[PDB]
UniProtKB/Swiss-Prot annotation, chains A, B:
GO terms for molecular function: DNA binding. It is found in: Cytoplasm. It comes from Bacillus caldolyticus. InterPro entries: Cold_shock_CspA, Cold_shock_domain, CSD, CSD_CS, CSP_DNA-bd, NA-bd_OB-fold. Residues 4-63 form the CSD domain. The keyword Cytoplasm applies. Keywords: Activator, Cytoplasm, DNA-binding, Stress response, Transcription, Transcription regulation. Induction: In response to low temperature. GO terms for cellular component: cytoplasm. The keyword Chaperone does not apply. This is Cold shock protein CspB. The lineage of its organism: Bacteria, Bacillati, Bacillota, Bacilli, Bacillales. Homodimer.
């Protein structure tokens, strides 16, 4: 995987961005979030994830809350 | 986003393929499956999904049972 920190996440809209050291912020949608908790993230949360290419460009897949 | 049907799914391994009328089969991993409950699919299940491109090639994202 790839490690990052959530930059921001809007729990009403269901999306945000993950900040990665020395790379561009990666879009994250709630549908990519793993686990049985609520499909939400909060600023500063540590996550692991894969980058995939969707029709709008890079986005996160397999987002696991650490 | 589009619709298809599960072609086969190995429950133990957690992956299979979605068939698409008129198109190529799409790999699906359990981590893409939406909703509550145990992440699994049965052959013949109707689904909606997105296609994304990862390091291993095209695969499904946002798989919703229909
Ligand atoms: Na086909």
């Amino acid at each position: 995987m790839q490690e990052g920190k959530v930059k921001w996440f809007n729990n009403e809209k269901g999306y945000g961005f993950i900040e990665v050291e020395g790379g561009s912020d990666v879009f994250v949608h709630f549908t990519a979030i793993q686990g049985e908790g609520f499909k939400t993230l909060e600023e500063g949360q540590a996550v692991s994830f894969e980058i995939v290419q969707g029709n709008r460009g890079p986005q996160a897949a397999n987002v696991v809350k650490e």
